[PDB]
Design a binder for this molecule. Structure first.
Ligand SMILES: O=C(O)[C@@H]1O[C@@H](O[C@H]2[C@H](O)[C@H](O)[C@H](O[C@H]3[C@H](O)[C@H](O)[C@H](O[C@H]4[C@H](O)[C@H](O)[C@H](O)O[C@H]4C(=O)O)O[C@H]3C(=O)O)O[C@H]2C(=O)O)[C@@H](O)[C@@H](O)[C@@H]1O
Ligand SMILES: O=C(O)[C@@H]1O[C@@H](O[C@H]2[C@H](O)[C@H](O)[C@H](O[C@H]3[C@H](O)[C@H](O)[C@H](O[C@H]4[C@H](O)[C@H](O)[C@H](O)O[C@H]4C(=O)O)O[C@H]3C(=O)O)O[C@H]2C(=O)O)[C@@H](O)[C@@H](O)[C@@H]1O
Lengths: 379, 380
């Protein structure tokens, strides 16, 4: 498969078996084609579809509210907002791109993967429509920055913590490599998206917000580099991917994993089991890319000898029994998120206990959740 | 006497008295509240018709919301029919603007009407009136007097009345409209239109199939149904019906829901059992605010089966002290601050100084903008 943000091994196996006419896969792909129809008809979304504008006055600037910040009832204007870790302020849904970036990302991802497997031009054409409108359109496309992502009313300093929102559209950016060579994705479309991705990569690496997020001591730094790798892989910068793995990702794992394999930065969160898992999901998506060029982030040690497999080891019994978790978790943990994580970690590590547990937890055969498309093996 | 309505009339009268006498503590408190209220004077009045997606009637004046715990079924091609996940609010609810707009309207009308009652300044009646007219009686912007499409569920075949509980967000504003009667801005015509609207809503809640079913609910929905019923009846000055509902429906319903140890078994089975135990009692609390103004104390009056609502407070009191001690399912954190007004209301109605003391110890923030706390200087 082309370099991108997916399990390349599972995708190739699906395309092989679908082209071979294998019955199990052909039936699974035909279900996925029924799921995917809503995306062929779906009107492409745009970040410009908001009423309340950013401080730049530019509807093309992405802006969201940082989810745990709330009006202060003891202030006349509610300002400045105050933090309630783990309590999502429903005001976030007043920023349309919060859910629209997810909807776009789901649509482009599903369509791009279904085009790669089946070769049907109708999937590239619709995938292309979503990509053009979201990224490159001179009126509807988003500016390549995350300046106003997770803004906070009344906050005086700028932060880069909102960059983590980018994972919702950076996976779709990656899957665009899958429609290159279709009739619908012209050389001109590719150049524009290449140029947008080049400007976004530049902003990520050189803006102050980008630099600060690249140095975050918790799961934000890990997601920053996972996003970084999707952009770099889209741009075919294989040397930079190696450099990011060795100079940023591995040192981060070495610092954030304690000797017992816990992630202390996530243990202090009110949703500590969710955020431990979310840290590892960043590594999981990062590894999907690094493992396509021979770097296994699950088993490759940092300079201090720590390996991401130690973090999985620490959490595994709590994926078996979340009720055993001893740290603060003020909402129930969704065990299903462990399925893909334990499958990904298990195959990379040769740990059949992890792979077995992934299949016992399982994914629903008929689920329309787009990230589960490659994982027939769990269905 | 304050007009009959959905508030602690004793505290409101105390506030108006002291404010008019010029007592310093109250005058300063009311001047804070006037600063808080300023946003409501400037606020553009909201309307249920400010939606894009219409209800099956095709009428924008029909209130419509999504039942909050119903989610798309990802294993279905269309996500239909939705499935229930108790206690997990589907953010799709925020796609129905009247869900939050009913709250915002309710807050503004409540705050402004109470501030007019306390202070006598016409500017509060005038703004309160603007919000009431637009929400209720306006021939284009006012809501139709029904809750047919409240908490609808995609793909569900049966009609339900469970969405009626949404009405509490605007039924308190309806009640407070009595406080601006006699202002210059609230004309005789305004009163008649709202009287007529309230009559039609009372007819709908009592005679529609959805209203009848909700009136028979065996959990907190039945309690809130009667609390809402009382707000409407008190607005309409139907004191004989208030007595009848208190004696023939609320007290038997309340007695039926209290187990021998004072627990509320219907609420213990919920994923948010401490929230819904508290929510059941808040219904009784607001109902008692109306019944006690005509001599019926719902906290201390036993039902005919011998249960009394004070038993339910007794069961929950130690867990209001220490919410972490709660042993039943509570998949989100419980807000202890909700115990403050509840224990003060029950504590005063019962002469229980331990409840009142704890209420003041938990307390409310002196400067909070939460409009339901306006009468509770005593806790601030
Ligand atoms: O978008 C979502 O709704 C949600 O996103 C994922 O969780 C994210 C949040 O979006 C958000 O960015 C949050 O950031 C936290 C975090 O703790 C962050 O490191 C930083 O912490 C600050 C904070 O001010 C503290 O008080 C302390 O001083 O440390 C600071 C620091 O610099 O470390 O900011 C806060 C915050 O603003 O709340 O957590 C994110 C995360 O940790 O990834 C995720 O839950 C996802 O499922 C969901 O989609
Ligand atoms: O509006 C909110 O977001 C929220 O409202 C308050 O909680 C309300 C909910 O809005 C909702 O109506 C919910 O109804 C429950 C309840 O359990 C009810 O009895 C009924 O239950 C049905 C259901 O079919 C079950 O599957 C079972 O068969 O029992 C049935 C029964 O009739 O007993 O409907 C469900 C449901 O639709 O989810 O709970 C309400 C309540 O208990 O008052 C409240 O949380 C408030 O703070 C908040 O504003």
């Amino acid at each position: 498969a082309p370099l991108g943000p997916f399990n390349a091994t599972l995708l190739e196996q699906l395309k092989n078996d679908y082209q071979k006419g294998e019955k199990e896969v052909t039936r699974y792909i035909e279900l996925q084609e029924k799921v995917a129809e809503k995306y062929i008809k779906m009107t492409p979304l745009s970040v410009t579809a908001k009423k309340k504008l950013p401080p730049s006055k530019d509807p093309r600037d992405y802006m969201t509210l940082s989810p745990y910040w709330w009006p202060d009832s003891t202030k006349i204007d509610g300002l400045p907002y105050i933090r309630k870790d783990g309590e999502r302020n429903p005001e976030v849904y007043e920023y349309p791109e919060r859910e629209n970036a997810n909807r776009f990302g789901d649509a482009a991802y599903c369509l791009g993967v279904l085009y790669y497997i089946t070769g049907k031009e109708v999937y590239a054409k619709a995938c292309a429509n979503h990509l053009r409108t979201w990224f490159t359109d001179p009126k509807l496309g988003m500016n390549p920055n995350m300046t106003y992502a997770q803004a906070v009313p009344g906050m005086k300093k700028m932060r880069g913590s909102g960059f983590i929102d980018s994972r919702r559209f950076s996976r779709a950016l990656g899957v665009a490599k899958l429609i290159e060579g279709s009739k619908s994705w012209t050389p001109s479309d590719k150049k524009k998206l290449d140029d947008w991705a080049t400007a976004f990569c530049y902003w990520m690496e050189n803006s102050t917000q980008g630099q600060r997020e690249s140095h975050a001591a918790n799961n934000h730094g890990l997601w920053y580099e996972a996003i970084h790798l999707m952009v770099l892989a889209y741009l075919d910068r294989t040397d930079r991917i190696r450099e990011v793995a060795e100079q940023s990702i591995l040192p981060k794992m070495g610092a954030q994993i304690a000797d017992d394999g816990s992630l202390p930065q996530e243990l202090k969160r009110t949703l500590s089991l969710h955020y431990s898992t979310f840290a590892l999901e960043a590594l999981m998506e990062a590894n999907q890319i690094t493992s396509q060029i021979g770097i296994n982030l699950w088993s490759t040690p940092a300079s201090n000898g720590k390996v991401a497999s130690q973090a999985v080891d620490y959490l595994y019994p709590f994926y078996l029994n979340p009720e055993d978790w001893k740290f603060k978790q003020i909402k129930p943990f969704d065990q299903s998120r462990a399925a893909i994580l334990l499958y990904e970690a298990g195959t990379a590590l040769g740990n059949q206990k992890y792979v077995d547990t992934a299949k016992r937890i399982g994914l629903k055969y008929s689920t329309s959740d787009v990230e589960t498309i490659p994982y027939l093996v769990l269905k």
